[model samples]
Target: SMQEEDTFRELRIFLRNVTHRLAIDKRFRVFTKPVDPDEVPDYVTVIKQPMDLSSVISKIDLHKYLTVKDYLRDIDLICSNALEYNPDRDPGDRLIRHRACALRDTAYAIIKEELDEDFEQLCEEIQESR
Candidate 1:
């Protein structure tokens, strides 16, 4: 259907065009974890190591984060196959278009959650200061 072609065009344009969220990767946090207990009898001598806190925080955990960054880094490059795609080229474009859409789909949810949390924490501090 023409619907897919239209959507394909939109995705190409979307990545070519910049918006507020994608502009800040360089400025993103230049920046760990938890516990267990041990005893004997069953001999569960488990000792947990402390994690570094600096690089530990993120919207996605390390595996998912690396996936989006290292694996799926560029929408345009990843989507290039769509242009030359055959076998209807329909399915190829369909999947490639996801590069942009997936980012937006994920970006807003992550943005809102983190932004709301940050502002809420700040408001708590400001109110507490009074």
Candidate 2:
């Protein structure tokens, strides 16, 4: 029951909290919504899989994520897609790529802090049981 019920509730709350923080980040503005394939038709072709913060948040709201790791993967994918497409070449893309990096860093820090705190509590409980 703990594995099934508690895990889902905790994971869902954690994901929502993390995504809400990211959604408000100024640097992450460009990535808040889905890219227009019609505007950049080659975008889909170049980056086979596209990810965005809005999409991630919706997935969380829809209860699609099973674990924190799975949600983090999408965060990574969003930045990875940006860097891959922007390429840091010339001056224009450099800005976008750097913003992607900043977004990823903030997300990573928040996730690490939240997950580490939970793991700490879980470990304490197990040790106490022992």
Per-residue accuracy of model 1 over 1-130 as CA lDDT, tens digit each: 4743443344333322222244344322110112222322221232122221122222123322222222223322222332233124466555545543544444455544543444335434533454
For each candidate in the order shown, give its overall lDDT on alpha carbons.
Answer: 0.33, 0.80
Best by lDDT: 2
lDDT of 2 by residue, 1-130 (tens): 4655565677778788888888887878898998998888999988988999888988988877766667878999999999888765588788898888888888889877668666545534543554
lDDT score of residue 41 within candidate 2:
90
Q: How many backbone overlaps does candidate 1 show?
A: 3
Clashing pairs in 1: 31-55, 32-52, 32-53
